[PDB]
Design a protein around this ligand. Structure first.
Ligand SMILES: NC(=O)c1cccc2c(O)c(Cc3ccc(-c4nnn[nH]4)c(F)c3)oc12
Length: 240
């Protein structure tokens, strides 16, 4: 019998399809249930509510559970970046079958042999500031409507801001990350701070950017150490 809280037990069952507690240990990740009544949960629910894109209208999202996560080794790996400016709490979606690998190994860059199709700024680690842009990568359906999504603190520093696909060979001098500029942005006036990290939970507005290939922002880092995975949400997709 498992000694984990029931929501964590259910998460492990979802991730692994060995005893529950043995599978938990394979993830090398501390997993804590976030209290529904907390400041953290209120912020995260608002981020989900406010940043669902008007063009992603096939479904709406219901948050079932929020977990706080701490990967083994993360404290030391992230330390060089924890003092960089412009650290932002951003979305990353993936198929459920990828999460055992993501939690144990962290987010990784696609290897040389994988196609570059789907990556407009080359192989890196990609995030959104609009929940639905990332939720689309969960590849849920009516028949299979529960997905998992991550929130990471991403150390962006000085962003190399681009509007059209470009597989850059190197970051320019002093730049730490790429930001793809979309036509729509969470309203920047509404940014708040959660534990020293910026949370862009404003409702979507026109960015006023013209001559861009993107409907919505995206953020890319090219060093796996620039990512501090912090929350994992279990989402219900309510298809319309
Ligand atoms: N994942 C996100 O939340 C996210 C947020 C913002 C922008 C993007 C963006 O362009 C991608 C790209 C992507 C995702 C998955 C695969 C894949 N291949 N095989 N299995 N999965 C891939 F080839 C490319 O992901 C994004």
């Amino acid at each position: 019998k498992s000694k984990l809280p029931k929501p964590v037990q259910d998460l492990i069952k979802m991730i692994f399809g060995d005893p529950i507690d043995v599978n938990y240990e394979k993830l090398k990740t501390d997993i804590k249930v976030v209290d529904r009544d907390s400041e953290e949960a209120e912020i995260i629910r608002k981020y989900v509510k406010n940043t669902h894109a008007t063009t992603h209208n096939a479904y709406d999202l219901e948050v079932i559970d929020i977990f706080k996560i701490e990967r083994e080794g993360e404290c030391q790996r992230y330390k060089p970046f924890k003092q960089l400016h412009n650290r932002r709490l951003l979305w990353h979606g993936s198929r459920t079958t990828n999460f055992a690998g993501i939690l144990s190994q962290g987010l990784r860059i696609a290897p040389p042999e994988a196609p570059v199709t789907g990556y407009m700024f080359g192989k890196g680690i990609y995030f959104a500031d609009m929940v639905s842009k990332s939720a689309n990568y969960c590849h849920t359906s009516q028949g299979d409507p529960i997905g998992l999504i991550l929130l990471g603190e991403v150390a962006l520093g000085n962003m190399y801001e681009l509007k059209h696909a470009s597989h850059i060979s190197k970051l320019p001098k002093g730049k730490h990350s790429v930001k793809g500029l979309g036509k729509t942005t969470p309203d920047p006036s509404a940014n708040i701070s959660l534990d020293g990290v910026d949370v862009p939970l404003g409702t979507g507005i026109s960015s006023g950017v013209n001559d861009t290939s993107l409907l919505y922002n995206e953020y890319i880092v090219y060093d796996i150490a620039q990512v501090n995975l912090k929350y994992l949400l279990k989402l219900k997709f309510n298809f319309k």
